[PDB]
């Protein structure tokens, strides 16, 4: 084959380690992990030999890969000759989420075997305690392999006093994975969310942290269960803001209000906007309905297809990866239009958007809930959101512009099936239960809750998990996590193409929604197949969307659960009462609630926002 760049090689990596060329070794290692990061856990285009038996057995080949990569890393890190640079460590923290999987999808589970070689204290109380010689080289080796699935004891105060920078870097790393679900991982992260924000405020800059997974940090805290999970977002905002000013940022000066073709100018900063992404399917209709009230400049990237740019009076490309340049291009774009309104429909998916959220480009800066969590940023005034999707407003630092239920009509996907065949099984022997859930939405409570349902159900149940983001080397880890709760009563399906995903669900007799962070598109998917399921509701928007959307689709209120314990009774009831279940499905199939989502009056967004530029003009003047 001919190709753009040389593939990373397990063999090169192995050579390096034999030759005790540590520099090459770290390099090959870093290049492997990066490539895996780029492919979301897929290992195609990593070079390694392997027994022919594994040619057609992908899951087995993956495990084989992870085991073999584990062993090489072991041979390397237990070398006491091996000196890790700070830069070196910093780069590893960025890809620690992938290091975790090298071990966790291997039979070895974690790298605690490597940690044990660093202990220097033969007279210690518990094996779970590693005592280190007081030099920095070995501390960084230790931190780097302090993986989510570690059983080794670490105390944050102790560590934080030893080296703020490392301790912070590791806390970043442990919030970074898209699957933080196992008791060991979820508990490491729970603790960090309570302990770290205080310590994070104290940073002036991102210079000494793994800057490149910052956005993962920001997004992922919404998947804990703590009332106050979002606190780390405040602390991070401050650091980013601080880091922005040290770069020589001047907040844009609010003077005039440029008009175009009558209407004032709205700048829309986009993260992941293709007509295929759900950010379009939800928040594109409301954006066009605001061109009658405003003039829309949309700033996205190359990736955005034609149909995506056509939702703007005009669309500009962001010029590359450099954040400061991205902000320069946005400042001049807002000065040149004395722009009135900055709208970001998603904030979190791109780091540069979080930097934007901590500066002044417009007198009315608004977000929506492409990622449904507050920002804890002072430079963000309002949040667009459908009214039936709201729990407590106290969950948000901003002010909630609560729109009617129809204000945000969804454009369906043009992969959506039209000939769908329906499967209402009467008196099935095993009630097959589907769970549409990306990996971020799995945790010990949810899996404990499913274990309980299975134990208590008076009927046989099998869980099929359709696991968005469980790709490549992620999956064996995840599948095991599920087996650890449900043994032979669950199947864990990898990330699949859409039609295949639907085939998995179409095979179920009902579905269950994860909590705390619930589903949206998964419920469209649910009714699309003519199914009913259960969900939880809660104060946070990502808890409550489910409640709302159920109601909007004309499913009854008993399928909605305030407590974990409610969830169980309802789940069981719906698995037990076959005749009830089918009656509810027959309801939904005939009363096609779905088509009502593509219905609605999309104007309210632009109106409510003009109404605020009105109120803003009159309190300040122009
Ligand atoms: O094996 C699989 C599993 C799922 N899918 C499909 O992936 C889609 C992603 O939405 P899904 O409900 O899975 O995740 P969700 O949290 O809603 O993601 C959106 O909301 C997220 C909130 O931040 C946002 O990050 C994200 O971009 C949004 F999509 C959904 O249509 C599934 O039908 C698939 O094709 N194959």
Author numbering: 0 to 621
Give sentences from the paper.
Soluble HMW1C-like N-glycosyltransferases (NGTs) catalyze the glycosylation of Asn residues in proteins, a process fundamental for bacterial autoaggregation, adhesion and pathogenicity. In contrast, NGTs are two-domain enzymes that consists of an N-terminal all-α domain (AAD) and a C-terminal catalytic domain that adopts a GT-B fold, as shown for Actinobacillus pleuropneumoniae NGT (ApNGT). We focused on AaNGT, an inverting GT that catalyzes the transfer of Glc from UDP-Glc to Asn residues in the consensus sequence Asn-X-Ser/Thr. The heart-shaped structure of AaNGT, either complexed to UDP-Gal/UDP-2F-Glc or UDP-peptide, shows the N-terminal AAD domain and C-terminal GT-B fold catalytic domain, which is composed of an N- and C-Rossman fold subdomains.
